[PDB]
Design an enzyme around this catalytic site. Sequence first.
Site, PDB file in Angstrom:
ATOM      1  CG  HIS A 123      48.891  40.241  40.797  1.00 34.42           C
ATOM      2  ND1 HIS A 123      47.766  40.544  41.531  1.00 34.42           N
ATOM      3  CD2 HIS A 123      49.763  41.245  41.041  1.00 34.42           C
ATOM      4  CE1 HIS A 123      47.955  41.662  42.213  1.00 34.42           C
ATOM      5  NE2 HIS A 123      49.153  42.117  41.907  1.00 34.42           N
ATOM      6  CG  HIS A 172      41.187  41.477  41.775  1.00 35.64           C
ATOM      7  ND1 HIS A 172      41.051  42.107  42.979  1.00 35.64           N
ATOM      8  CD2 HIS A 172      41.365  40.190  42.028  1.00 35.64           C
ATOM      9  CE1 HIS A 172      41.172  41.189  43.951  1.00 35.64           C
ATOM     10  NE2 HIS A 172      41.340  40.005  43.392  1.00 35.64           N
ATOM     11  CG  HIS A 187      41.439  35.462  41.239  1.00 39.21           C
ATOM     12  ND1 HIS A 187      42.777  35.557  41.547  1.00 39.21           N
ATOM     13  CD2 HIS A 187      40.832  36.338  42.004  1.00 39.21           C
ATOM     14  CE1 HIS A 187      42.896  36.433  42.580  1.00 39.21           C
ATOM     15  NE2 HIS A 187      41.712  36.952  42.838  1.00 39.21           N
ATOM     16  CD  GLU A 227      41.994  33.466  44.113  1.00 36.58           C
ATOM     17  OE1 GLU A 227      41.554  34.372  44.851  1.00 36.58           O
ATOM     18  OE2 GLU A 227      43.190  33.246  43.879  1.00 36.58           O
ATOM     19  CG  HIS A 284      38.110  38.231  44.593  1.00 40.78           C
ATOM     20  ND1 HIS A 284      39.311  37.566  44.646  1.00 40.78           N
ATOM     21  CD2 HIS A 284      37.157  37.308  44.776  1.00 40.78           C
ATOM     22  CE1 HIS A 284      39.044  36.264  44.878  1.00 40.78           C
ATOM     23  NE2 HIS A 284      37.762  36.058  45.003  1.00 40.78           N
ATOM     24  CB  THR A 291      43.468  34.775  47.379  1.00 40.94           C
ATOM     25  OG1 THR A 291      43.280  35.694  46.302  1.00 40.94           O
ATOM     26  CG2 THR A 291      42.180  34.545  48.136  1.00 40.94           C
ATOM     27  CB  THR A 292      47.692  37.992  45.801  1.00 43.94           C
ATOM     28  OG1 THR A 292      47.188  39.213  46.342  1.00 43.94           O
ATOM     29  CG2 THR A 292      46.841  37.555  44.644  1.00 43.94           C
TER      30      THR A 292
HETATM   31  N1  LIG Z   1      41.582  54.645  45.374  1.00 47.07           N
HETATM   32  S1  LIG Z   1      42.934  54.482  44.569  1.00 47.07           S
HETATM   33  O1  LIG Z   1      43.806  55.536  45.045  1.00 47.07           O
HETATM   34  O2  LIG Z   1      42.710  54.616  43.130  1.00 47.07           O
HETATM   35  C1  LIG Z   1      43.720  53.051  44.767  1.00 47.07           C
HETATM   36  C2  LIG Z   1      43.090  51.823  44.511  1.00 47.07           C
HETATM   37  C3  LIG Z   1      43.747  50.599  44.690  1.00 47.07           C
HETATM   38  C4  LIG Z   1      45.067  50.539  45.106  1.00 47.07           C
HETATM   39  N2  LIG Z   1      45.804  49.393  45.281  1.00 47.07           N
HETATM   40  C5  LIG Z   1      45.441  48.073  45.052  1.00 47.07           C
HETATM   41  O3  LIG Z   1      44.297  47.827  44.651  1.00 47.07           O
HETATM   42  N3  LIG Z   1      46.422  47.171  45.367  1.00 47.07           N
HETATM   43  C6  LIG Z   1      46.260  45.773  45.199  1.00 47.07           C
HETATM   44  C7  LIG Z   1      46.428  45.006  44.062  1.00 47.07           C
HETATM   45  N4  LIG Z   1      45.881  43.735  44.238  1.00 47.07           N
HETATM   46  N5  LIG Z   1      45.330  43.763  45.560  1.00 47.07           N
HETATM   47  C8  LIG Z   1      44.581  42.680  45.993  1.00 47.07           C
HETATM   48  C9  LIG Z   1      44.979  41.361  45.807  1.00 47.07           C
HETATM   49  C10 LIG Z   1      44.208  40.241  46.190  1.00 47.07           C
HETATM   50  C11 LIG Z   1      42.936  40.370  46.772  1.00 47.07           C
HETATM   51  S2  LIG Z   1      41.876  39.116  47.127  1.00 47.07           S
HETATM   52  N6  LIG Z   1      41.979  37.965  46.000  1.00 47.07           N
HETATM   53  O4  LIG Z   1      40.575  39.658  47.075  1.00 47.07           O
HETATM   54  O5  LIG Z   1      42.283  38.496  48.316  1.00 47.07           O
HETATM   55  C12 LIG Z   1      42.570  41.698  46.937  1.00 47.07           C
HETATM   56  C13 LIG Z   1      43.339  42.784  46.570  1.00 47.07           C
HETATM   57  C14 LIG Z   1      45.458  44.998  46.113  1.00 47.07           C
HETATM   58  C15 LIG Z   1      45.041  45.350  47.484  1.00 47.07           C
HETATM   59  C16 LIG Z   1      44.160  46.365  47.768  1.00 47.07           C
HETATM   60  C17 LIG Z   1      43.845  46.589  49.102  1.00 47.07           C
HETATM   61  C18 LIG Z   1      44.433  45.817  50.135  1.00 47.07           C
HETATM   62  C19 LIG Z   1      45.357  44.836  49.790  1.00 47.07           C
HETATM   63  C20 LIG Z   1      45.640  44.593  48.462  1.00 47.07           C
HETATM   64  C21 LIG Z   1      45.713  51.764  45.337  1.00 47.07           C
HETATM   65  C22 LIG Z   1      45.056  52.989  45.179  1.00 47.07           C
HETATM   66 ZN   LIG Z   2      41.218  38.196  44.360  1.00 49.60          ZN
END
Ligand SMILES: NS(=O)(=O)c1ccc(NC(=O)Nc2cnn(-c3ccc(S(N)(=O)=O)cc3)c2-c2ccccc2)cc1
Ligand SMILES: [Zn+2]
EC number: 4.2.1.1
Length: 259
Positions: free
Chosen positions: A63, A93, A95, A105, A118, A197-198
């Site tokens: 995504h 990440h 968009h 967004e 973001h 937003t996802t």
């Molecule tokens: N520190 S580490 O161990 O390397 C680590 C590092 C990230 C993750 N996971 C992760 O980033 N999951 C995920 C993937 N996408 N999103 C996500 C999606 C949309 C938004 S937004 N547009 O900003 O609203 C923000 C975040 C996540 C996520 C990350 C945290 C909470 C919820 C989701 C897991 C482990």
């Molecule tokens: Zn985002």
Amino acid sequence: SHHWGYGKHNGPEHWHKDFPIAKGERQSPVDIDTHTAKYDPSLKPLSVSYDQATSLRILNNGHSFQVTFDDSQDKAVLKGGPLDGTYRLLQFHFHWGSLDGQGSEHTVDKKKYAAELHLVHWNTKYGDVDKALQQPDGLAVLGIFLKVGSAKPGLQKVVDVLDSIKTEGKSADFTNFDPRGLLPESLDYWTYPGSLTTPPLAEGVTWIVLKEPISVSSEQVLKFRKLNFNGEGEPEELMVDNWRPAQPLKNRQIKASFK
Ligand SMILES: NS(=O)(=O)c1ccc(NC(=O)Nc2cnn(-c3ccc(S(N)(=O)=O)cc3)c2-c2ccccc2)cc1
Ligand SMILES: [Zn+2]
């Protein structure tokens, strides 16, 4: 991989069937009407402390693509502004669009930017991100608009590895990346209570959206648009237009840090 996505049959207008909070009271993104937002003299100064950031991996998650950070200690944190306490950087990440006039967004007076960055942080008082996700003040996302013009040198290391993560589930080492190189000069911002937003569209995000966009080159954003939503050896479907449209503001006030 998930059933949800950004196409006609699985995109944002469908998400509410599996995630009913999609039609909630504090969804994101929103249009920021610059003439309704209120200057808030009581906002404390915003503190972006990324000098000790430790990046780990870059990943195509089907995504977007994300850069992950070590969040096992207070290494890269956001504090101040509307925030109480300390929020740790987990990942960033983007968009983006199929054309330079769409991709963001958030919108500003209905203006869409070519892309939006973001930087996702979680409130350390909840101990881990999984627990923070269940709280109304669990997360803070620093949002930065991208416009097409001059290249952003601090983005080029990201651009150059994207051909190694073309399809969903691909990852690569991405150590020693400095996210300070992605920030504009000014930290002037708007802030409002919103959501992811996802999916799962969790209503636990304090949004901090910087007024100043960064400029990236046409060649940089063209490289984003060569990514794929699909996994290796499925029909090729370009990762473009991975943005959710603006949602109803409902009973919320957008505050500005600046006059
Ligand atoms: N520190 S580490 O161990 O390397 C680590 C590092 C990230 C993750 N996971 C992760 O980033 N999951 C995920 C993937 N996408 N999103 C996500 C999606 C949309 C938004 S937004 N547009 O900003 O609203 C923000 C975040 C996540 C996520 C990350 C945290 C909470 C919820 C989701 C897991 C482990
Ligand atoms: Zn985002």
